[PDB]
Each structure stands twice: as structure tokens, then as C-alpha cells.
Amino acid sequence: ILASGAKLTERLGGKRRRGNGRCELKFSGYSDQQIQWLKDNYQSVDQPPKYQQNKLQSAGDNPEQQPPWHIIPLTIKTLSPVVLPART
RNA sequence: ACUGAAACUGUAGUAGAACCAAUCGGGGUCGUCAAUA
Numbered sequence: 001i002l003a004s005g006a007k008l009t010e011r012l013g014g015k016r017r018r019g020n021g022r023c024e025l026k027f028s029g030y031s032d033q034q035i036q037w038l039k040d041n042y043q044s045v046d047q048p049p050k051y052q053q054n055k056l057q058s059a060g061d062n063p064e065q066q067p068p069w070h071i072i073p074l075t076i077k078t079l080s081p082v083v084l085p086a087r088t
Numbered sequence: 089a090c091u092g093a094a095a096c097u098g099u100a101g102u103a104g105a106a107c108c109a110a111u112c113g114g115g116g117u118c119g120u121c122a123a124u125a
Contacts, residue, residue: 014098056090084091 002027003034 006025013021 012096016096017099018101
């Protein structure tokens, strides 16, 4: 699908219909081979599997807390913009 | 005591209307030339 949908993309952005934004969109490692497999196989696909969350697990085997504390500093650098909701 | 999810800044719109690269001009026709001794 992703190979196929990438291939069919011809335009993005503003004034697509008036010749802005003509493009090729290619995934690394998806080719017409991935397209051809779907063409060969799409009739025998089914529904995708149902989504479920990754649940937490607990053993309870931690030792009881004892001093001293350790303070491990973590430096965070933003690489994209980051949205941290104050109010929606 | 626990990151929400998902959502194309897109959609319509002719850098165009107007403006003469033009106005005037017979491919024509006659007197010397030179300055010393």
C-alpha cells in the first residue's frame, strides 16, 4: 500500500491544480516490487488485525527503597518542535 | 500514579488592458587650384 500510495502521489501543497508542487515521493526500500506483490495478491488479503494497547506488566520484585538517592541528570534537546499541551 | 488519538493551510482567481517604431530628406551635382619674387 505505502509503495503504491507513494507512487500515485503527484502533487502537494498550495495551488496543486494550477501546476505548483509537482513531485516524486519515494520510500527507501519500497519499489514496484512492493506494488507488484499487491497487484499479485490483493484479492486474498483480509482485514488487518485488531489494534490493542501495549499493556504494563509488574513483577513486584523491586527491593525496598534505601538511601542514598542518586540524581541522574537528563539533558533534553528539541530536534523538531514539541507540543506539550498547556490547554486545548 | 504513566506522552491522547486522528486532521494536506488548503480551495477559486490568465500579470493584464491600451499604444503604428514612427516623422523630415530627388543618389544628387561645375569652377579653378596654389603663393610667391
